[PDB]
């Protein structure tokens, strides 16, 4: 049984350093596709 509260597990990440890491990897990836190309992060496709 569950002796307590029915809760859901959840993973926490810090927003500021994750946004800085995304900006850094975008600035790194921008060395291969010129300057004025809009890089868009999206969700997954699907499957299992």
């Amino acid at each position: 049984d569950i002796i307590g509260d029915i809760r859901m597990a959840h993973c926490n990440v810090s927003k500021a350093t994750w946004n800085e890491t995304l900006g850094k990897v975008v600035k790194q990836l921008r060395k291969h596709f010129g300057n004025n190309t809009i890089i868009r992060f999206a969700q997954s496709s699907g499957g299992d």
């Binding site: 049984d1 569950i2 029915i6 859901m8």
Partner: protein, 48 residues
């Protein structure tokens, strides 16, 4: 055959479809006798 209904009913939280309560028979060390057992299984573990 798992007779399985919803555990923790009428909960207004997010976790509603998961945590289902099912009962089933299981064999013991004496093969003529059985044992009724109760357990909780997730939504991704049971198929109707």
């Amino acid at each position: 055959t798992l007779q399985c209904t919803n555990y923790a009913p009428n909960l207004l939280s997010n976790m509603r479809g998961e945590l289902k309560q099912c009962s089933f028979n299981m064999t013991t060390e004496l093969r003529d006798k059985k044992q009724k057992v109760y357990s909780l299984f997730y939504r991704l573990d049971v198929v109707q």
